[PDB]
Amino acid sequence: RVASVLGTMEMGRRMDAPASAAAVRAFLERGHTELDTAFMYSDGQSETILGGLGLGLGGGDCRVKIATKANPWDGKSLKPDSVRSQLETSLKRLQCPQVDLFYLHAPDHGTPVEETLHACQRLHQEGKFVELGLSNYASWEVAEICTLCKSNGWILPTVYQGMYNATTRQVETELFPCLRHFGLRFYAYNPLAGGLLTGKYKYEDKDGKQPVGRFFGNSWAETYRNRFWKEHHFEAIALVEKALQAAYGASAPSVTSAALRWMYHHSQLQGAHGDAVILGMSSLEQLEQNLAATEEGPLEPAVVDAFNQAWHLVAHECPNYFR
Amino acid sequence: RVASVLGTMEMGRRMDAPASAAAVRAFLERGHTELDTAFMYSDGQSETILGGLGLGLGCRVKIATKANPWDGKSLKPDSVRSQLETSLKRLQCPQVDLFYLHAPDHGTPVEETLHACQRLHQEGKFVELGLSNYASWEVAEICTLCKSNGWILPTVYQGMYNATTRQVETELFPCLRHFGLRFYAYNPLAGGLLTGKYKYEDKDGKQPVGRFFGNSWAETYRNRFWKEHHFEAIALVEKALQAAYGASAPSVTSAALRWMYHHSQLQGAHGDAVILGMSSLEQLEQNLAATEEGPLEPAVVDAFNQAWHLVAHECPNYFR
Ligand SMILES: NC(=O)C1=CN([C@@H]2O[C@H](COP(=O)(O)OP(=O)(O)OC[C@H]3O[C@@H](n4cnc5c(N)ncnc54)[C@H](OP(=O)(O)O)[C@@H]3O)[C@@H](O)[C@H]2O)C=CC1
């Protein structure tokens, strides 16, 4: 019931075009339909790869849904010209006439939001995208946006893509109530905390080993460390690992499995609202493993309580869902 | 620089009219000017007492009141008007300086409520509009609706804020700054928990009569603040006060209030204020003295931060 969307951030980075195409195929073979990319992902290479799969995206002949995003970074603003330019470039790369979902990837605090939204309204009138989404906007910024659109008679956003996992729940307090009021569904990213919730790291890895991956050896590693790589977060993971052992003994699932099942079975995400989890991977084996976990059932209550105890351990230092 | 407002919730409850009048006098004698009451306080007795003090309220003294949605009164237009007009009669004044929506009415579209406030403002029944207990996102909706409709915007938000209760800092404070609302803090001592006068185990045996026991709102207040981790937090601050100042240490009450005036997100430059609470004149006088004390040693400010981190996972919601 809670849906799954395929994250394509690693396509064109760790995953070459063949690996990416196998990934999409595995995802589709499980009955899922929706793909998440962005103007910025692997410097345009993610969209380019997806556009070359012969899926016929944006066409009436297409069962696959595609989402992309414009961003304000590196001096591109979210001023009208920049929003148009990014979307049109995305359309060329994806080799499609319109995308199913277009996001504002993160806020442009230098550009009045009414300007940006007027550009989105116009681009929607032109048939460049079907639905509008927001990502990384505060609840109060979402409300302002929705209220402006209603009063101007513009397209409202209908999807919010936000940071959410078993140990990162800031979104629950104010954002989820706001979204319910304005009618936005929620797609969760960082569902394994960039990989921290696989249990494959030790806190001390940051001094010696520094294993190349999401948290080391790239341009966003330090952002990810600051987001999730905290001692209390490792204590939290250990707490959940111990609960899995105690509740299931020899038959215990992986912590990865458990962390994803939390999302689909025990989070505030509701299939009734059209909510979804955006799965991440840097390889096809990781993806296949994750897809298996999505088809697993609920967890023992003690493990759910453990995850809650885990969140309480880190809630004081939760990263902001907004930027 | 951070201002002080007098909370009048106890006027007509633990404080009779003479004690209340002496309280107002002590407050005004310190140079302060602003009083906070509400339609609901002591079943209308708070406003009535204030209205009988001959202060001429609609003038150096400023008065705020609030309409609420509770007990089946909605915040539908008729209810808003009816509450304000009754408050005006009780306060014996033609207009109030600040009128709040006390808490959200989730059964009534907010645009209805706001149109009523616009009309009542046009009539000169109140000068400024305030909000209390609305989420940051609800404040943003409201401000955006008022701008588009050409109506009076709210300019004051009255919210729950103290050294161990800081949920408002994350989203609400940024929102307020953007829309130009000043912030007035209530529960600055966590209803009295931050005086250090209680032990967690008081809930079992002693149950001392006061904010937390023996009355209709005690259970709400226990659910809000009466948590083991909160008492751990208080003890941590008391230990830091002993360490930092030794024999010269201030009271934890004095410290908690100085935090608000000197070390919180409240800014005098924005017109922000603390709403002082008391259930007696001695309490008030002790609290007023703390407002005139200076900043705290860094180590105590850090201890307060450590204390907040202890309780942040179970912080009560600032919105309703
Ligand atoms: N709107 C926004 O600001 C955001 C949008 N997104 C979108 O959401 C998608 C998902 O988020 P993402 O953060 O990638 O998801 P995750 O939290 O699941 O992190 C995924 C990473 O964790 C590791 N991992 C995943 N599965 C396994 C496994 N089974 N075993 C071992 N390691 C595993 C891999 O990292 P590694 O092997 O490198 O160590 C993978 O790259 C993205 O692809 C993107 O489309 C993502 C971030 C921000």
Ligand SMILES: NC(=O)C1=CN([C@@H]2O[C@H](COP(=O)(O)OP(=O)(O)OC[C@H]3O[C@@H](n4cnc5c(N)ncnc54)[C@H](OP(=O)(O)O)[C@@H]3O)[C@@H](O)[C@H]2O)C=CC1
């Ligand atoms: N808009 C809203 O929803 C809210 C508005 N308010 C307003 O804010 C004002 C202040 O809030 P309030 O919670 O009262 O503020 P506090 O957090 O300071 O709580 C005040 C209570 O703490 C105790 N106390 C205060 N000073 C001392 C002292 N020096 N020594 C020992 N105990 C002390 C007394 O309780 P005890 O009975 O135990 O003696 C007093 O009644 C209220 O009067 C009201 O006007 C208040 C709450 C909600």
